[PDB]
Amino acid sequence: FVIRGDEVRQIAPGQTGNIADYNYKLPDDFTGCVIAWNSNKLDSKVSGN
- Of 14 and 23, nearer to another protein (C-beta) is 14
CA 26 – CA 45 distance, rounded (Å): 28
Cα 19 to Cα 11: distance, rounded to the nearest angstrom:
8
Q: Which stretch binds another protein (CB under 8 A): 1-9, 14-22, 32-40, 41-49?
A: 14-22
Give the one residue of 15, 18, 23, 39 binding another protein; rule: CB under 8 A.
15
Residue 6 interacts with another protein (CB under 8 A)? no
| Residue 34 touching another protein (CB under 8 A) | no
Half-sphere CA count of 12, side-chain side, radius 13 A: 8
